[PDB]
Scaffold this active site. Structure first.
Site, PDB file in Angstrom:
ATOM      1  CB  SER A  75     -11.258  -1.353 -10.022  1.00  0.00           C
ATOM      2  OG  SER A  75     -11.584  -0.083  -9.437  1.00  0.00           O
ATOM      3  CB  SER A  90      -3.167  -9.821   2.292  1.00  0.00           C
ATOM      4  OG  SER A  90      -2.415  -8.995   3.180  1.00  0.00           O
TER       5      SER A  90
END
Length: 329
Positions: free
Chosen positions: A155, A258
């Site tokens: 997180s 990504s």
């Protein structure tokens, strides 16, 4: 020398307090491996908004990261500024919006969307500097592997990992951002609300999105690294109840991250999909953590992407080299 401590400070096993950094008193927990065979790889795991540093190190539910020291890794977990040097503090003042130019209070992980955060378009911030200084200092008492310094987190800690890999890739060999934010913005660096942000990314899932987690604009190049991004599946969301409600959805954020890292040729990116939601990986925890770290340790700083080999993760995970292909249809 790569290793040095600030004047008046000497590292020790366990809790360290009063480490001077950018004028603040910082703290961190050192868990050395039983043998540093001439140079130990390093793991720097970071908590998010509500878990205490000691939980992440010692409690299975929060990761049991100290266990990696049983496998040869030097584990150093840093304490958040807001926890005021207490490793047992879970949420407290940490659970709050950011201030002084930052988006979220736990970690100086992303410039605020307004003018207050403009200096952070280029300044890495106090936490990025602390994390490096911390590791450089531990390295004066235990032998560490300069080419195998890895950081990670869950997180806000995964967000902070993304920021440190973007601003200080010269130091870290890579890391594992687990469900971290990207604070996606439009190409000109401006921010639109959560809902629009979710939609703009779902509308262009392969696009390289800029984000307040990193420099503005994002680097066209970085030093060599290996990065394992972890998404926890459909329920990987952050919702804090009314009035804010749902304010982070990690599908677009781990897609965006990504995409960016996969676009940097000298950086190996691994996209891992899991099903535990938003918290430390819960299925086969110990095995996953060790798999992930050994995978990063197999690609020391300066390795060629073409030589990276990805082995199968424990059951509960599905990883592929490159960007996520399982977030959008």
């Amino acid at each position: 020398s790569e290793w040095a401590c600030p004047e008046g400070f000497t590292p020790k096993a366990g809790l360290n307090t009063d480490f001077p950094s950018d004028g603040k008193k910082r703290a961190f927990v050192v868990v050395p491996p039983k043998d540093s065979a001439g140079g130990a790889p390093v793991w720097v795991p970071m908590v998010g908004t509500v878990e205490a540093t000691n939980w992440n190190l010692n409690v299975p539910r929060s990761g049991n990261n100290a266990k990696l020291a049983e496998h040869g890794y030097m584990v150093i977990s840093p304490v958040r500024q807001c926890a005021e040097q207490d490793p047992n503090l879970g949420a407290g003042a940490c659970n709050g919006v950011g201030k002084d130019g930052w988006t979220w209070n736990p970690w100086n992980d992303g410039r605020a969307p307004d003018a207050s955060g403009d200096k952070y378009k280029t300044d890495a911030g106090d936490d990025v500097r602390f994390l490096e200084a911390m590791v450089r200092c531990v390295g004066t008492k235990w032998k560490l592997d300069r080419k195998r310094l890895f950081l990670g987190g869950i997180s806000a800690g995964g967000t902070m990992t993304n920021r440190a890999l973007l601003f200080d890739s010269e130091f870290w060999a890579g890391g594992m951002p687990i469900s971290g934010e990207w604070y996606s913005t439009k190409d000109d660096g401006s921010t639109v609300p959560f809902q629009e942000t979710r939609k703009m990314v779902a509308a262009a899932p392969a696009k390289i999105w800029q984000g307040r987690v990193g420099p503005y604009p994002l680097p066209s190049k970085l030093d060599p690294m290996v990065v394992i991004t972890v998404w926890g599946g459909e329920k990987d969301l952050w919702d804090c109840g009314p009035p804010l409600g749902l304010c982070s959805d990690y599908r677009p954020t781990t897609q965006a991250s990504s995409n960016y890292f996969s676009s940097i040729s000298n950086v190996v990116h691994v996209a891992c999909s899991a099903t535990h939601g938003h918290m430390w990986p819960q299925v086969n925890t110990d095995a996953f953590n060790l798999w992930a770290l050994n995978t990063m340790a197999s690609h020391p700083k300066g390795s060629s992407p073409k030589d990276f080999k990805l082995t199968a993760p424990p059951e509960g995970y599905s990883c592929k080299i490159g960007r996520f292909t399982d977030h959008y249809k």
